[PDB]
Structure formats: structure tokens, C-alpha cells
Design an enzyme around this catalytic site. Structure first.
Site: not given
Ligand SMILES: O=C(N[C@@H]1C[C@H]1c1ccccc1)c1cc(Cl)cc(COc2cnc3[nH]ccc3c2)c1
Length: 286
Positions: A14-16, A20, A140, A144-145, A158
Site C-alpha cells: 500500500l505504501g513505501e 518502512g 507533510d 496524498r497523506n 504521514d
């Protein structure tokens, strides 16, 4: 005490990020038919001692966050296990992807109404209001967050700074932090001063994104270098600085609010409590 990771079934990335990555996971045994879906952050394959340290600090930060519009820490992996953090799976993905699919309802094929845009923004303002009470600076904030659950529920996160989808949102210089310059107040760019007031600036930009239905990048036709130089024009204050334009879906009243978020003086930007009230109430008469 912690959660047994043996019970996790990894299903999708899902994210990178820097240290992590987040996976969609299935938890084996909230009806008997359906499995429990969660999102799980684990170390990157190239992780080191440094990564573990950063992971441990993120756990400390997350364990504090308890608000309806901020993601919550459901658990962490057992001490024996490789580090993991578990949160709710937000089934409609990040807000940028979600909104980008829609067009504004035509008063005269997924569409979304202007009041729903206000509802989305208000929820973000409520989450930020809460962070402000903790004196916690996000640094941030952007669509997108933000994550979208059921019934247009919004939670601020975040994460996923290395998502290829958002590569253009970050300004990378060798030896420097990765910076979201198009969302940053002038004093962040020039002095590295991040405060609640610069979170308000970023909220203004995030609100602009929402009202653009996330179909355009802030200052999209300007280069990174031009965006950085614009911060200089805010500092010099000779009236040559430029602002994001009024979105077509944005009434002048709401635009004036956004302009207050981009006040040169930090103290002149509205507090999140004020932003929330406007988006939940005043904005409804327009
Ligand atoms: O933001 C996180 N950690 C930061 C410290 C927290 C924080 C700091 C500052 C402000 C707010 C939050 C974070 C952690 C975990 Cl475990 C998981 C995630 C991502 O999760 C989901 C869930 N569903 C999804 N669907 C589609 C994609 C997707 C991603 C993000």
C-alpha cells in the site's frame, strides 16, 4: 503486550517510505464469513539498525494519536517478532487517488458535491485541530497523506514518502531532507521552521487540492526552482509573491479563507479551530 504476527496474511503493498513499507493484511479470525483487513507497516527489505530506531520512534508517536480523524495504532507485533505496526485498513485509499476519480456534480460516472468537498476538508481541519492541541507539527500535510474509509470518513496519516505516484511532490537534493516544497510555507523553505502555523499553510494548499478534486499539482506549471524563489518573494514582501489560483469549485468566500492560510506572518494565519468552524458552518451559505 503485543499482537501475534503469525496471524497475519500479507496481501498487497500500500505504501513505501524511507525505512518502512505498508501492506494490506488479512487476519484469520467482524462476521464469521469475512476476514479482518488491517494495514501493517513493516521494515523495508534494505532496513538496518537505523531503520529499527526510526520504527521504534514512530511507534512512540503513533501511540499518542487518539482522534476520529487521525489514524490509530491498533497494535504492534510480539517482541519475539520482526517489528510491525498495525492500523485500520482504509478501504478507499488515499484522498488524492479517491478524489481524482470524481468530477464536481453538474447542477444541470462518479461525481461529488461541493458540500461533500466541505465535509472532507472539515474532517481534515478537525484532525489538524487535534494535533494542534498536542502541539504536534505534522510537517507533510497533503491529500496524498489523507486516507478515506467508509462513508467519506477521512483520517490524516504521514506515510509513503517513496510512493512513485507522488515522486513529483518532493524536492530531492543530495545530502538534504526530502521536502514537499509546494505545500511548504515560505519560512519552512527558507529557514526550516516548521510550526502549527506552517501546518495551517499546508492545510490551505490541501484545501486547494480538495477543491481542485486533486486533478492538479499546486503551482503545477512552475518549476521546483520557481516555487523556491517564490518563498523568497514572500520574505522580501515587495508584492511579487504568487498564490494558488481560485479553483472553479471554490466560492470567493472560501478562497479568501485559503488566502488567510498563506499570510506572510505566521501569527496572522487562522487557527485550525477557526478553519473547522468555517468549513463546517459558514461555508454552507455559499
Ligand atoms: O502514517 C502512519 N504513521 C505515522 C506516524 C503516524 C502519523 C504521524 C503524524 C500524523 C498522523 C499520523 C502510518 C502507519 C501505519 Cl501502520 C500505516 C499507514 C498507512 O496505512 C494505510 C491504511 N489504509 C490504507 N489504504 C490505502 C493505503 C493505506 C495506508 C500509515
Amino acid at each position: 503486550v503485543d499482537f501475534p504476527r503469525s496471524r497475519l496474511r500479507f496481501k498487497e503493498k500500500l505504501g513505501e517510505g524511507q525505512f518502512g513499507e505498508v501492506h494490506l493484511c488479512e487476519v484469520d479470525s467482524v462476521r464469521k464469513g469475512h476476514p479482518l483487513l488491517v494495514a501493517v507497516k513493516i521494515l523495508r527489505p534494505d532496513a538496518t539498525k537505523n531503520a529499527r530506531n526510526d520504527f521504534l520512534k514512530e511507534v512512540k508517536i503513533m501511540s499518542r494519536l487518539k482522534d476520529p480523524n487521525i489514524i490509530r495504532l491498533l497494535g504492534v507485533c510480539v517482541q519475539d517478532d520482526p517489528l510491525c505496526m498495525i492500523t485500520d485498513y482504509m478501504e478507499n485509499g488515499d484522498l488524492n487517488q479517491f478524489l481524482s476519480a470524481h468530477q464536481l456534480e453538474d447542477k444541470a460516472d462518479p461525481t461529488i458535491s461541493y458540500p461533500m468537498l466541505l465535509h472532507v476538508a472539515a474532517q481534515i481541519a478537525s484532525g489538524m485541530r487535534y494535533l494542534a492541541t498536542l502541539n504536534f507539527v505534522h510537517r507533510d500535510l497533503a491529500t496524498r497523506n489523507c486516507l478515506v474509509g467508509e462513508n467519506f470518513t477521512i483520517k490524516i496519516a504521514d506515510f509513503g514518502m517513496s510512493r512513485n505516484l507522488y515522486a513529483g511532490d518532493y524536492y530531492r537534493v543530495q545530502g538534504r531532507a526530502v521536502l514537499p516544497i509546494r505545500w511548504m510555507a515560505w519560512e519552512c523553505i527558507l529557514m526550516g521552521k516548521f510550526t502549527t502555523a506552517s501546518d495551517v499553510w499546508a492545510f490551505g494548499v490541501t484545501l486547494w487540492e480538495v477543491l481542485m478534486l486533486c486533478r492538479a499539482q499546486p503551482f503545477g506549471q512552475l518549476t521546483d526552482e520557481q516555487v523556491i524563489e517564490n518563498a523568497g518573494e514572500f520574505f522580501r514582501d515587495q508584492g511579487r509573491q504568487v498564490y494558488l489560483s481560485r479553483p472553479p469549485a471554490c466560492p470567493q468566500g472560501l478562497y479568501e479563507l485559503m488566502l488567510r492560510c498563506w499570510s506572510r506572518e505566521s501569527e496572522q494565519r487562522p487557527p485550525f479551530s477557526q478553519l473547522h468552524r468555517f468549513l463546517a458552518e459558514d461555508a454552507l451559505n455559499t
